[PDB]
Ligand binder design. Structure first.
Ligand SMILES: Nc1ncnc2c1ncn2[C@@H]1O[C@H](COP(=O)(O)OP(=O)(O)O)[C@@H](O)[C@H]1O
Ligand SMILES: Nc1ncnc2c1ncn2[C@@H]1O[C@H](COP(=O)(O)OP(=O)(O)O)[C@@H](O)[C@H]1O
Ligand SMILES: Nc1ncnc2c1ncn2[C@@H]1O[C@H](COP(=O)(O)OP(=O)(O)O)[C@@H](O)[C@H]1O
Ligand SMILES: Nc1ncnc2c1ncn2[C@@H]1O[C@H](COP(=O)(O)OP(=O)(O)O)[C@@H](O)[C@H]1O
Ligand SMILES: Nc1ncnc2c1ncn2[C@@H]1O[C@H](COP(=O)(O)OP(=O)(O)O)[C@@H](O)[C@H]1O
Ligand SMILES: [Mg+2]
Ligand SMILES: [Mg+2]
Ligand SMILES: [Mg+2]
Ligand SMILES: [Mg+2]
Ligand SMILES: [Mg+2]
Lengths: 368, 368, 368, 368, 368
């Protein structure tokens, strides 16, 4: 019988009276009721999007998006809720009106050479999703295996310096995995509630792997937080070389992916599509390791970082806290500016910091 | 087989040759045939809308709408029939073109203090419907229980002077109910054919209740004629205080309803959505008890009331007739003017009447 | 989205903690949950069946079925709930196993002649439903008009003594209707809550009528409580003549109905299908009027009535209470026994009562 | 287009080459392919059933079912996979052929009185699920709130000694919750991967609560691992009194649930339906706290426990490990035997153990 | 269950890394994914369109379309892929913007008379498809038989000089078929992979035939490469007479087709619809046999042919290679220019060639 009544959407509304994520602040009864009945063609629903945020109220003073996407169509189907969140996260970028430009030309960047004072090592990271396949939060076992197959077959075609091997987690010893993790060259099993609540730890470690070059200066994580996570690393300060390797490797990987008929998810409004809305746009997180001595006990570093648009997090991972005054300094925003612009911004900020690490003298200028 | 023929819509057309309600005057074969096949998403149909009017031909010289709505979508689905009725009821207000503005600021109203000559007591009343739940004419048992749960849980959060208790009719003794009714602080079982024909007496008294404050100056009827009926009362003439209490209590109730994820039905064209189209807009019925002595022997009292836009009905209820020359004087129109405007109109009219109760002298001016 | 959840059936379960009808006693959560999804092809649902019982808790010590049927298929679709009720009502008749036999031969009955002591007048009544048309609780305006048309066209073919006229309620003056009602020759507007809650007073008086013979000894009510109510009256005590007229008139009416291609609802298990399950089987209520003197002062009147299988109700209608010690004495059970058997039982019972009216002497024997 | 091909079921088959749960041992490609396309009416699928087992390979030598049910229909829809698992878990009970009998009569049990040597305290526990509502793994927010409403309203009717209060986790301070947990009178947030992977920690702590009597000897957990978890506790050894209180409280709770039209999930083959197949049947876990001295240094304690059909786990919870030689001794099997039989078995086993705690002398007999 | 996942479109993408047809060059992952799910009303799909091109990589330096159409709707449904291919084939004609004009008036053409030096014989050919019937690649047996019936019944009405007989391949001896093929008056069984991979050799020789006039100067192939192939032949050089016969015969055939209610597929953008996109527009291939002596030893013959827009292929068929320096010289483009224009172009080109066959003297001018 069709005379039976469904639960009113307001009956399903989450209790967000003590939540501290952008989803909680931007979710309203009207929006929830409007979107309560829609779904992406693959079956992704709003409740599945906001489950991670609902489960984790979020620590006060710490900003977390609290939502994930199950496929490319999500950002279009549930745009009424994602657009305010994307705008709030990326310092006012408006997906509805503005457009994103991608530029990976490593020739444009200048400077490059650093001073081995507190940089230690430099890293650049991005993420890519294969079009036509569900994202990690929603992907089935078959889709995850398909992503792994596509990526591995493509990377098999890499030649020259960017030639390496793919290691499957299921086939890797626990000691080897721990050693790789400690060396910053591997990812651990998701333990933080954000990923588990999002449903991104299902079937672990089935179809998760790491492809790395012989020099271990070019890595690709397969099915950990996104379909692919491309990392270019260097135990030095020649950020120009790291970014050049990153750009050429990414171009080769994209060419090989397109060879077999696969494409990366990408649209003009949002750029490269990923799971966490915080990673939209370019997904670039060019950064460096930074030490305590000249950076732990100066005057007003947080103001300088905010003015320079630099993020500082705890070494060893986002979940881990800073220890011994050693942090990771990267960029804040992904959507909007381009990869070259973000790398140049990071380089200028770190140059200013090593210039404004005053311990020999004083006169920190901040210089917004 | 699809070759079978349905009854022509004109076969179902009601016999309204001796009817005296706006539905009968505005229902035509073309409109009925046009709307005979449509239905709201919850299954409400035109025949269900007009059943109350069809069953009751209506006493001549007495205007009754003769229709009810089963949900919010009704006024949009069957607008072709409701819009003329709404326009006729509310002295020409056009839902299709005009817009409604709601204003409950008790600061705007002036005067307030009355003279204890015939006012005796003052009262203000409105109605509210919870969005997502069917209206009393169409609500099932589960929906009615859900409305009761939402309202009771919300009112549990009221603090301060507006703190009271919820009494369930099913748990209330017959003597207590009779005492409350005789004291004007309760509602009786619907006996008048208008409500029973509309299907608003089903499952009585299941899920019908009354929440009242300790002073019994603030009451809320749950599931009698609408989802909620909010009443602010005073055994005096300080209409300003009554309206201030009404406004603040309504604001608190709305805030608590929204806190749990529920909203009141409301749209710009019609304002607050209710069952009887006569109550659309604000649903406000600010009024006062009035005695016989000076008003009963008035020269042209009906003319003064009509010019001042004041409705006069029999004390003890709409169904009951005036006895002993004691009536209830309230406002006429709900849609269009705002709550503050209606209260000010009622206050000005009653001030004029107490000024134009001439028995000491003569010279009634009417003063349209 | 199909991921939305419906209200659990137990959420819709009626609150029957203070009900006194067979529906309340025989309705259980399991049965309700089982039957809450089914519906007859015309859309009749269980809640519609039990609404009349739910609305009216029922006076204690008074037995009311509390359910109605919206069409013929109802008794088959909701048999799980009706069968226990039918069995309880008709003193153990089992619809699932037993079968009903119809016999209207007035030749079999003997005696007939009564004594003009307390009988005053005699009456016989049955009801019939036209197959293919919804019953009064569920019939639309078109279906009711179709029933009226079929019955009127058929009755137009009656000849001989059973020749009369059809009077439409909508075309009868109030005084004429009141006079007919007072003369026990007409039906009044349904005012008792049992019929109104069942939805059998909709569109009154549209398509309700009375066809009566010139002698006013053979009447047919059209669309009051069933599609047709056939009555044979006589202001006397010659029950044999009344039953003979009843039988021949019913046979002629059935023949004329079948002539145009219409049939009466009927099946072996239940006999003639009607709205109230109490009227199933034959629907026969052969009875008489009885006075106060020798019966009001009866020694063990209820015991004799129960032993003889006779019902006593208030004169002027079931709703009206007995006044002046004058009652109506009829039979109790309809399903099971046949019409001839029922009339013979009534005749024997009235003969015994008039013989056991002892006021001249004593010695009432009851004689179960 | 319908010419597109779906992923073959074998493409979705989990990689169970290193798994140690009954699901892994009993799941085969044929069964998976057969059940890959079916679903319960509420949308529960096989992958959702086996996700918890797939995610957790299971510690070797530790037996875990590895599956959960999302509703009552699951055990019928996916019986082809659950039946072998149920049979293996409950020492050969065959759901397809055998039948379960429930008996809670506390009069049958004898003995009861214990010796305060190592018992310390006694406890009895069962679980119940409200029919018509999805189980914790699959329940939405609205369904969980409905379960809480039903249980709280029912328990409000408890009188006599079993009269207490309901405390909502969302409204309980962290210190109070920790104190209750430490006192063995509360449940903590699910942290063990078994529940989180099953999706039973969603929306925590929304709609989870604890209703306990004034003496705190009768508790009911609402929405932690099942819809309801009923516990009868005593800081002593009078197991007879504990079981009597348990039985009478459970009977009263069931009566109050049925009063409003709700039923507990229950069928003859499986008994009371719960989430973990290990808890099917009665869900009874009558047990006691046991100390180290005469049991830690036991000669062949595991053999005696296995022969007596007594399970021993770590104090403080199943996840926690035994500390200080203090364990919890309860029964092993739930389906099959009845509640009285299980309680009698536990009492006899503990009596034997306290008799066979030989430290004063030797001669442990095991006595299978 | 609808939770099963389909193969991503990129999984079905053909491997075209070594292909040399316009389909391979113009097919891209985005286009394939966009069109992977669409289909014509008769069930034709993109994979069926491109199967012939996928199977045959294509000889380098030889241009083949690599696609076929299964019905008229194909060119509209899959226009996103056909339009670039049509534009590339027909020297830049844009189907989306430009329009095609058909003109068969044989009066406009001038000259006509040729010199019997290398012409030997002249031929003109076109193709026509009956609307409402699937094209040879997709036609079933019934549709092919219907096409044969329509064409044969129409041609039966031809009178005058264009009067002949229809010969069925199934009823024709192998020796007779070979003799007809050798005389250039018949078609052989499709052996070249292009037609077989396209599915145009199914059920051979069922419903394939040849209708030829008594003089054998007017032939019509039924169901070989298209529904109808109309050929006008002459063993001479009077191209004017051949084209006049062609025009009048085509007009008569079209009139007779329309008489019975059938139409030729035709739309303004593309002209006459046929299977191979290379034949769209007019399908006209006016041409002549050409010998070796003067043309074989030509100085820059390919340049002259390209400048004059004349195609040269091997005698005996497209599959066969040129032998003895004898080729077939026809027009290149079909869509765009009209039939009269194409015939005039061919006549002018052959006149120039016979004038620029210089062996008596030198001075070839090419004269673009
Ligand atoms: N600049 C860096 N240099 C060296 N290692 C790094 C750097 N940034 C991140 N890592 C390594 O990457 C791992 C995970 O980094 P994470 O914070 O998850 O990056 P993201 O936020 O981009 O996912 C950490 O264990 C850390 O050791
Ligand atoms: N101004 C007033 N003062 C005191 N009691 C009132 C007043 N207006 C209404 N009531 C009480 O409310 C009850 C129902 O009022 P009703 O006419 O139904 O109001 P509405 O038309 O807004 O529903 C009556 O029994 C009456 O005693
Ligand atoms: N035996 C009878 N003799 C005369 N009038 C009768 C008799 N039985 C019923 N009536 C008249 O019929 C009217 C309705 O009867 P009712 O109690 O409804 O019968 P039923 O239960 O068969 O419908 C009453 O007003 C009454 O006057
Ligand atoms: N016999 C007992 N005596 C006292 N507390 C107990 C006993 N059994 C269990 N508990 C308490 O119950 C809590 C959870 O028990 P748990 O192992 O989850 O039981 P179950 O397996 O029935 O859920 C523990 O924190 C523990 O303190
Ligand atoms: N100009 C011509 N003169 C004589 N015969 C021809 C001529 N053109 C084609 N043919 C004959 O037609 C047959 C098939 O021609 P084909 O190359 O398939 O034409 P199309 O490309 O139009 O289908 C060949 O066997 C050939 O003998
Ligand atoms: Mg990370
Ligand atoms: Mg009212
Ligand atoms: Mg009656
Ligand atoms: Mg537990
Ligand atoms: Mg050819």
């Amino acid at each position: 019988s069709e005379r039976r009544r469904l639960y009113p959407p307001s009956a399903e509304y989450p209790d967000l009276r003590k939540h501290n994520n952008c989803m909680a602040s931007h979710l309203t009864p009207a929006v929830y009721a409007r979107l309560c009945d829609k779904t992406t063609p693959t079956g992704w629903t709003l409740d599945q999007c906001i489950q991670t945020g609902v489960d984790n109220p979020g620590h006060p003073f710490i900003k977390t998006v609290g939502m994930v996407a199950g496929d490319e169509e999500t950002y279009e189907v549930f745009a009424d809720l994602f657009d305010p969140v994307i705008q709030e996260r990326h310092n006012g970028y408006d997906p509805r009106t503005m457009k994103h430009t991608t530029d990976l030309d490593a020739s444009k960047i200048r400077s490059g050479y650093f001073d081995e004072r507190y940089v230690l090592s430099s890293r650049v990271r991005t993420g890519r999703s294969i079009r036509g396949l569900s994202l990690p939060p929603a992907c089935t076992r078959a889709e995850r295996r398909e992503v792994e197959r596509v990526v591995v077959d493509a990377l098999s075609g890499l030649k020259g310096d960017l030639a390496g091997r793919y290691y499957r987690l299921s086939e890797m010893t626990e000691a080897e995995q721990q050693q790789l993790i400690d060396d910053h060259f591997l990812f651990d099993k998701p333990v933080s509630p954000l990923l588990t609540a999002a449903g991104m730890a299902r079937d672990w470690p089935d179809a998760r792997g790491i492809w790395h070059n012989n020099e271990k200066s070019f890595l690709i994580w397969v099915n950990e937080e996104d379909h692919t996570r491309v990392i270019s690393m260097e135990k030095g300060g020649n950020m120009k070389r790291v970014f050049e390797r990153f750009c050429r490797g990414l171009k080769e990987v994209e060419r090989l992916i397109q060879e077999r008929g696969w494409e990366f998810m990408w649209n003009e409004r949002l750029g490269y599509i990923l799971t966490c809305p915080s990673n939209l746009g370019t997904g670039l997180r060019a950064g460096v390791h930074i030490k305590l001595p000249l950076l732990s006990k100066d005057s007003r570093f947080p103001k300088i970082l905010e003015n320079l648009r630099l993020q500082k997090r705890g070494t060893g991972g986002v979940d881990t806290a800073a220890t011994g005054g050693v942090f990771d300094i990267s960029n804040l925003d992904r959507l909007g500016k381009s990869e070259v612009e973000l790398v140049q911004l990071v380089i200028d900020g770190v140059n200013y910091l090593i210039d404004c690490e005053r311990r020999l003298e004083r006169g920190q200028d901040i210089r917004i």
